[PDB]
From a paper:
The 26S proteasome unfolds and degrades hundreds of proteins to maintain proteostasis, regulate cellular processes and generate peptides with second messenger functions. It consists of a 20S core particle (CP) capped by one or two 19S regulatory particles (RPs) that gate access to the CP proteolytic chamber. The redox-active thioredoxin (TRX)-like protein TXNL1 is expressed in many cell types and was proposed as a nearly stoichiometric component of the human 26S proteasome. It uses its C-terminal PITH (proteasome-interacting TRX) domain for binding, while potentially reducing disulfide bonds with its N-terminal TRX domain but how it binds and is regulated remained unclear.
PSRpt5 showed five subunits engaged with the substrate (Rpt5, Rpt1, Rpt2, Rpt6 and Rpt3) and Rpt4 as the disengaged seam subunit. At the top of the staircase, Rpt5, Rpt1 and Rpt2 are ATP bound, whereas Rpt6, Rpt3 and Rpt4 at the bottom have ADP in their active sites. Although the density for Rpt3 is at lower resolution, we can with reasonable confidence assign ADP-Mg2+ for its active site. The weak density beyond the β-phosphate does not fit a γ-phosphate, Rpt4’s arginine fingers do not interact with this nucleotide and, most importantly, the counterclockwise-next Rpt6 is convincingly occupied with ADP-Mg2+ as well. As there is no solid experimental evidence for nonsequential ATP hydrolysis in an AAA+ motor, an ADP-bound Rpt6 implies that Rpt3 at the bottom of the staircase is also occupied with ADP. Like for the 4D state of the substrate-engaged yeast proteasome, the seam subunit Rpt4 in PSRpt5 is the next subunit to move to the top of the staircase and exchange ADP for ATP. PSRpt5 was clearly the dominant state, with particle numbers ~2 times higher than expected for equal probabilities of states and 4–5 times higher than three of the least populated motor states. The preceding PSRpt5 is the most abundant and likely most long-lived conformation of the hexamer and its transition to PSRpt4 is linked to two ATP hydrolysis events, suggesting that the movement, nucleotide exchange and substrate engagement of Rpt4 are slow steps during substrate processing. PSRpt5 is ~4–5 times longer lived than the subsequent three states and functional studies implicate Rpt4 (the seam in PSRpt5) in efficient substrate unfolding, suggesting that the PSRpt5-to-PSRpt4 transition acts as a power stroke.
Residue numbers in the entry:
A (entry chain J): 2 to 240
B (entry chain A): 338 to 420, 426 to 433
C (entry chain F): 353 to 439
D (entry chain A): 194 to 241
E (entry chain C): 306 to 406
F (entry chain L): 4 to 240
G (entry chain M): 5 to 244
H (entry chain K): 5 to 127, 134 to 241
Write the structure that this text describes.
Amino acid sequence: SYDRAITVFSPDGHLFQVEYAQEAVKKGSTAVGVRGRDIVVLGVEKKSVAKLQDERTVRKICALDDNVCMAFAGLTADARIVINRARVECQSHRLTVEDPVTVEYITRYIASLKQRYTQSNGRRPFGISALIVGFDFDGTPRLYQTDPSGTYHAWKANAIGRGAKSVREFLEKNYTDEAIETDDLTIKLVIKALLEVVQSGGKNIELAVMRRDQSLKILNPEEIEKYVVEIEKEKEENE
Amino acid sequence: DRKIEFSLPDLEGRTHIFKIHARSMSVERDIRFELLARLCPNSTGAEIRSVCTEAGMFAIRARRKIATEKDFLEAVNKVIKSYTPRYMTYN
Amino acid sequence: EFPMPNEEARARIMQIHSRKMNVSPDVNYEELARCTDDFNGAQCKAVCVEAGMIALRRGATELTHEDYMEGILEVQAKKKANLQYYA
Amino acid sequence: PLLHPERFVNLGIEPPKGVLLFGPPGTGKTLCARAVANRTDACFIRVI
Amino acid sequence: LRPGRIDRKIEFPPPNEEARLDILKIHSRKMNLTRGINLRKIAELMPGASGAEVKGVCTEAGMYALRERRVHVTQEDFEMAVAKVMQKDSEKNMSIKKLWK
Amino acid sequence: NQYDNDVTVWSPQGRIHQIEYAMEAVKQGSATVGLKSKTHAVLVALKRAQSELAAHQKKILHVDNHIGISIAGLTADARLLCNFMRQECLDSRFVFDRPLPVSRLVSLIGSKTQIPTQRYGRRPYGVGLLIAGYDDMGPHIFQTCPSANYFDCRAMSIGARSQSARTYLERHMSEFMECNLNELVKHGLRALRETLPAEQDLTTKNVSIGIVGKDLEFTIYDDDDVSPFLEGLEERP
Amino acid sequence: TGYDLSASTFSPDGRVFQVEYAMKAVENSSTAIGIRCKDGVVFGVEKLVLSKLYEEGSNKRLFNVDRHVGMAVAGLLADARSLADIAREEASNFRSNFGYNIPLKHLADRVAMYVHAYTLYSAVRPFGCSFMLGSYSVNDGAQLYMIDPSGVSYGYWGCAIGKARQAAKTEIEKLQMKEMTCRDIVKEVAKIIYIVHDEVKDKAFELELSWVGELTNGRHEIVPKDIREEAEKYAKESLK
Amino acid sequence: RSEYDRGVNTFSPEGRLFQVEYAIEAIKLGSTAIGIQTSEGVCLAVEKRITSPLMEPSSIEKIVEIDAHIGCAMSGLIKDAKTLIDKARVETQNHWFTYNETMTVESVTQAVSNLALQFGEEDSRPFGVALLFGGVDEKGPQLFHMDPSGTFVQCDARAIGSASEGAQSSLQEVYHKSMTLKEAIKSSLIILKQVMEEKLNATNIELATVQPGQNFHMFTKEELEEVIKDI
Amino acid sequence: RYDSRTTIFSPEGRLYQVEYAMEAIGHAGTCLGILANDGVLLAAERRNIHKLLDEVFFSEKIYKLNEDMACSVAGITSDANVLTNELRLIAQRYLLQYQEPIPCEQLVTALCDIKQAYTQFGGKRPFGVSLLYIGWDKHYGFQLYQSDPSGNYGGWKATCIGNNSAAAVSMLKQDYKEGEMTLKSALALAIKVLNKTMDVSKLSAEKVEIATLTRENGKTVIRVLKQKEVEQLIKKHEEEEAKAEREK
Amino acid sequence: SAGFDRHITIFSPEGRLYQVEYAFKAINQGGLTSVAVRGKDCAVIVTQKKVPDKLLDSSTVTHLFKITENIGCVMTGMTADSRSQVQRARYEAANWKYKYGYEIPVDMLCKRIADISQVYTQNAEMRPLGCCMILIGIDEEQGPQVYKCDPAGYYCGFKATAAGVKQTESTSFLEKKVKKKFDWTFEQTVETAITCLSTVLSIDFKPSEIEVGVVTVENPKFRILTEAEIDAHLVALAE
Amino acid sequence: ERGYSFSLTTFSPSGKLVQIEYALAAVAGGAPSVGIKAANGVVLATEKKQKSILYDERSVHKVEPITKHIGLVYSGMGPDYRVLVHRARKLAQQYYLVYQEPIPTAQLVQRVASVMQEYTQSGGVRPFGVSLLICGWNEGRPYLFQSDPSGAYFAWKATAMGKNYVNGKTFLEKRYNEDLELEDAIHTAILTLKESFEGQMTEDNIEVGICNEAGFRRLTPTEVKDYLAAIA
Ligand SMILES: Nc1ncnc2c1ncn2[C@@H]1O[C@H](COP(=O)(O)OP(=O)(O)OP(=O)(O)O)[C@@H](O)[C@H]1O
Ligand SMILES: [Mg+2]
């Protein structure tokens, strides 16, 4: 009886509506992000769109600024709003402070907006979790995850959405300094992270690759094919 | 005439119940029963006995004759917690 | 009609059921009656009895008003604690 | 009251004749009743 | 409905045109059909009907002959029975119908 | 029953149960005694410490040079009311250049507290205030219950276990008027000590004293400052 | 049940139950009477002293709305004090915008409309106090209006509000208020207040008087003690 | 109770607000935070409660820099804690701007409690987080604890969090007024290891001290290993 | 239950009011659109075909928004009118600010943002209208855009909304040749689909509206087919069906 | 069916507003009855003046409220709501006079009153005023006019009308009376109103309990008959 | 689904805005009203029956004008019809002020329906328990629309609303021809009301108004009398 209002505390001090908003994130396609020394990658599974529909409008990885990008989970309707407000915020921050927006700052503002939307009745929580990464630290790669609650955290590597637990365990098992020593190895690591929960062929794995002082580079199907071929070569070498 | 309420035990009461139900148990000497009591926030004495029984069962599963504090931690998990993103908001 | 005792009725009932007990002259039965809204005669008798037992628990030879208030609390199974936000 | 009726008759206290042990299940009311029956030294009647 | 209790779920969809013709020929077997009876056209005149409605059509076609005190039924009797049995009830208020564009 | 959820609902008996419940919230606080002589208005409060090595909570607040209160109830409401009275006293000092009379401030508190007891949107101010001060009409001891009804009292006591203090003040009502500062403070301390259980005693760490006098502004005595008043008290029988 | 939870819901038989409940709140309070002289209006309320620690005049129910208007509230004292503040505001606004003392009929109508406005909304509750307004001026004589939580207000030759309303009314009818002056009628008011007092259910009370008439040059003020005491003596002369 | 605990505007028959107490229950779900106030300074020790090795240990904030002379220890909801901590920082900057002086720990704690008081006072819900404000001022090193109701009080050695009760009891047994900073740190770390589910090391706690003269110091990894060596 | 208001989240994390609004869309009349190489079209079914109902607008289901955009409508009539009025307002506002026609997707995004705001803020029910969009723009050309009551849009080549949507969409996916459809073939396919999408036989012209979008000399003329050409398409489909059964 | 009667803005399954009907039933709570009759050149209203107490000031118990010099009213129902409605009516008349010059016609006057009642009954913010308003006034080119207009916001013109507890019986009596065409003279109009109220009430009608107000073409001013004229009308009625 | 039949801002599990159908049911329980569009004009006819002869029939008119060429007839709640006609007049005058041309009937109907929809989107505001039937003569062609509390508007050639509207609709499509004129339309309205009318149709009991090119005007009781005598 304590889960029908956002501003009502349960006897054990639980805001159950916020947790129910969290539950919507787990119903979205997985997004995997891992940062390297000179690379930040955003793995995303595709839902194998209908044969008679265009994928161009089902974009899940979007860039807030010229050098910060985010991948979300949960409902697309809330995610689009969050991304639009984040873009407006980074542009406004550039206007007031000529320095480019920081990935930490944009993460903090996204978390603040989510928190403001889970602070009163008559405002449904944003049921999306965002994986914000970027080289905005001017020489330092950063990765961030915003829970729909309004809390953000810095992760060396993290996963959100359906099957996030398995990918998180995988990454905890093999995210090492040696694994991310080069960009190609980091991209391969993203590929192995996404393969286990997304079993399928090509076009089901979308990777966003951003290099230092560069722009977002959504890998074409040919590139993910060559990387998955490389992974198959590695596993056949292992056997 | 007198209506006595048997509310859920507090931390001292939960520790006392843990000591009561582990007196016959073959436990180690370094078990922090206060920690176990704190890990069961709202749990009855029956749940404490179930935790002790499950700790003994865990230490029986592996061929060990002494139930370590790790077995009690696993039993607390299995009894209270079994029946992370939600806990991410609290810190 | 037998109605729920009012303030005067409750005070009179507590006076009746405390006649056999050694009670301080300082007990304000009018204050007790105010503190026991929606109490029937049986609940007022239980208030007196529980006040007597609370006095006996402390080893007090005579009852006090605070003993009666504590008995009022114990009749409805309520427990009073020092709340951390009530100062 | 059964063991030491003198502590109540001197002060004119009529002890309660009934208890309602209420609480969440498993909190130990039946255990307390069994403990009472273990040292009651009087006639204990459990009603089925 | 779980398997082991209900192993097979057999669905009975409304009869199609050929199924409706089969039901018509089954329930008009004892009826004295005239020479100009084309039961297939009656099947076509009953889209999305049920087996009970197909039988009701035969019953009402016979009842028309009963009304006229004859023991044979014509195609007209079947066509009027198709209309009498398959008469549906609509919204009757264009206000409610126009809530949804 | 079902008339117990809002302040804007009336019980069939003609009572507002939310207001009665707010009036109970005063009893959740510690006992506070306030009494006035001909020339002084002293209030004594008992302080509860949440932990042994935690400072005893502030119970007597400062409002102006001639207004002092003792809070017994919700801390949030107590601090809100204290802030409101401090602002009102500051406004009176700024506009009229004279100390705000205690009666007018207490009437303002009654008017402000009445609104939550009549319209939905906020709970009643669940704090009882023992306002003490000096003005042209002499010392004043006001008690402002959360029902927005305030009482001008010679010697009032509110909070938990305050009936014993009220009884003591009732017994020694006559002597209060013709008493000096020391005797008034001793009477207040005795009334407070009547509230304590047998085991507890009036120590310097849980007693706060606030005095407003003829030529003495409001002064809150805590800790060692209480000792001059505390020594000389007759031991409880 | 069901239709009495809010002040904006009509009962199936068509009665705002919250207003009746607020009335029952007024009936639970002590008796307050006001008698109109041939040449003024006299107020007398039975103010119980709940605890002896009070200050012989604390939380008085006699309020001065204006120089000539007095109010003799009975009921929820916080609501009564708020209504006195509203009446004072209305009188001050009338004086500022029109330049002359507000007529008692107009002031009673406006304060009643303010009261009635609180029985119209679900977000607010009806006032739990009933009060009577009295004033005197040679231009329009003596007037006495009683306003209850409903907001209804007509003039009264003599009215009572509180617990012993009925007994005070039975006794006040046997008084010829049409011709008596405000001197002996004060003694009469004290005597009626003393008649309407349980004295075995109510421990004690402090009688307080008030009046406005020709002898108080058209102004309303506390009845002087040097004649309030004699009114009390006449009340004691009556056995009850 | 179910009809009286659905809002901060409703009073229970006992007079209790059965929504502030739930906020106090919320702070019990956070990791234990321990602060000790000694003459030499104020120390703050907390439990990290790491959930994944991939998360950056510095990402989650339990002890923060309210100001150069005040540090705050967190326990409870992250969002409410962040809001309250930002309010504390803004208010300390405002006091420095207006009065050209560092605010007392009393005054900054009062400022935070002012925001914590507006839980439905018509300009929501109580801030389900307890803050341990520790620092030095003109009165010396001071430690203050704030609860969701906004009730704040000076504490010699307050422990908040999941293990508040046991850590507080052992703190009562182990604390004396003549304690120095080093023994304060050692005793706080011992108590933390007593009430911590996982074995104590340098990655599952963060230690912070504020001493007069020096500024807010948060112990680094090497310093943490140094202090946990003897304990 | 967890459907008292739109702001309520189910324990599984589902906006039950939003799902209710989408499931309610099937009550609306059948609307479909086919994207061809040379243009894009919309097809609608008139549920109300009473002889006492006069047809004055001829565009009850298909609305013109901009000189190069048009939209079909399926859902609540009042919400439909509100959304189309807002669509025209946004279109003219963008035209005033930028002095160029809207790139289709921006206007759809604006509507979807408005709808999402309606399903997010309390005290407002979700817009129970799902509407198809057609248009041409300089960046990607002809596009067919779908909108749901939740504000989730998506690019599509051929869809159907309203009664019996699933069957129409399935047969679209079955017999749509990507990149090999002309406007005439698209019209024939739309008529074939609408024939058995609705239970009414013979596909009466008065019960069906079709509007087509074309790019002629950089003008982007929006044409609503009159009864003559619709009847010609009906007879063409009838003769095609007769030819198909000749094999039987 | 019975669950829809708690909010005024909620429609019954049969399509009814039960709160409005309950407000209509609240009119009878006063226990009074008022009847209005329109003559050829006059409009007469009479109503009960119940004073069940010797200490009431009978001058202040009058239910006849003068909206303006040429517009009068009788208010039946709950007293406070009726007084609020007459204050609103006076304000409306004064505003109309200030804004348009010529005096407000009676029909327009409580048509505005009924519009206020209707906007009250549409938006659930305040309970409808449980009081029936009966208006009179001589209007040029139309002769006498009496309009009854209710909490629902329904206003109409009446040759004769009545509202109160004894409404249906009085209307039936007037139906029996206003069917026989006769000279509707001042004397005859007052007499027929008094007969209506007396017969429906079955009361000898002592002059102290009836209060009458009439506007005439000859004297287009609302005038309240005092004791002498009322007694003269009663004695002329009896003989 | 009785739990979703209360609020106006919630969707039923089936997806029905229940209060709108409830307001429509309130509309259909109103007084009968029929309007027919002829080749040369439009006729609006409603029955106006009082409970007694005690009511002035001419004081309240069910048929009211919006502009010189726009009429209004309703079936449902009169008090809501008054605010609706006031809003329609204001919208028409606003359009006239902006464009200096009498407002088109289609535009007037669309704006009035938008006003009707405005009350069907928030809790605490009740939908208009009245459906309007709007006449008009625009660009040399007759117009007839119906606006519902749902906010939907259509272009009825001829329809009957209110009580026994099914009978009136069944009479229509029988005696209605697309090539009639104003007098035949008036007669058709007279008979359409007749079978939905209880009792004698007096000159005071039925109110009609034509809406031809000369503009909308409410027929005086004399014209209704002679038309009825011709019909009778
Ligand atoms: N306070 C306690 N101390 C020790 N053991 C306890 C306590 N409470 C419960 N237990 C244990 O829990 C077991 C089950 O509890 P018990 O049978 O007394 O339940 P109960 O409170 O009577 O509940 P129920 O409502 O099911 O009757 C006991 O046998 C005992 O071992
Ligand atoms: Mg048991």
